[model samples]
Target: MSKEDSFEMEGTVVDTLPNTMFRVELENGHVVTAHISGKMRKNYIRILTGDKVRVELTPYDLSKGRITYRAR
Candidate 1:
């Protein structure tokens, strides 16, 4: 898939998991597992439960995504 093929959505952090992964609940009520984007990880952006976040999802798998940005 190409970069343009991915899509973005907003969600709330629901839980923290092992291996730097998180469980997020989307505005549409779908829960997906996500990991911090490379930039966020490199910068040490902390993600806590109840925080709003922007996620990037691929067309092939909507159940998993990358947490691209945290909403302030």
Candidate 2:
């Protein structure tokens, strides 16, 4: 994965939907779904809308999809 691909960005959670997925609104005006990592799910951590989050983007796709790390 390239450095840019593995980059992390700040975003706000707009909504959380079924299937343990979250709708996040990026600073760039792009909204995308963020899938909780297995570790987060195993830890029983839940995310909700209006929360600020740090997300890590996968190298395979740079189309706005990401994984949440922390809720602030």
Candidate 3:
């Protein structure tokens, strides 16, 4: 899906997974698996549970996405 077609929203880093995998969830039981992308992967910022993050999901797989940015 095109970047414009995908949507991004705020989510929480609910849990941590091994092998660079991140388990993110939102409002109630909305859970998603995401990984740090680009800048964040440079080792500047790592996604740990309890941190607010920005996740982008595509229509192709609603349950998966990328951590586009980190939210305060």
Candidate 4:
């Protein structure tokens, strides 16, 4: 949606379950659900994990967000 939502960066990892929601690490130490947005992605790459991990998590609503910027 090309708008600045109250989205933040957080990550623990996604394992594909529970409505396809993923876990994430955050400053507040609370687990969250995240989905992906093609808008803030690069070349439609795959998600890799090994620390140095993250996403914009462009939280568009309560307890939910989109992986909007540079992670995969």
- The models' CA-based lDDT, in order, is 0.79, 0.68, 0.75, 0.51
Which residue pairs show backbone clashes in model 3?
none
The sequence of per-residue lDDT tens digits that candidate 3 reaches over residues 23-63 is 88876667888887555569675535676888888788878
TM for candidate 4 is: 0.45
**What's model 1's overall lDDT?**
0.79
Over 2-71, each residue of candidate 1 has an lDDT whose tens digit, in order, gives: 5657788999888888887888888586788888766656878575577788887787888888876677
Candidate 4 lDDT over residue span 1-72, tens digit each: 586567456455544536644555454655556665544345565566422244454445545554544444
Residue by residue across 1-72, what tens digits does model 2's lDDT show? 634546788777777678777777775956667766777578784644576877666677655566655666
Task: Give lDDT: candidate 4, residue 34.
Answer: 62
RMSD per prediction, one decimal?
Answer: 3.8, 3.4, 3.8, 6.2
TM values, all candidates: 0.72, 0.61, 0.72, 0.45
Shift in Å, residue 47, candidate 2: 5.3
Of candidates 3 and 1, the better by lDDT? 1
lDDT of 4 at 60: 50
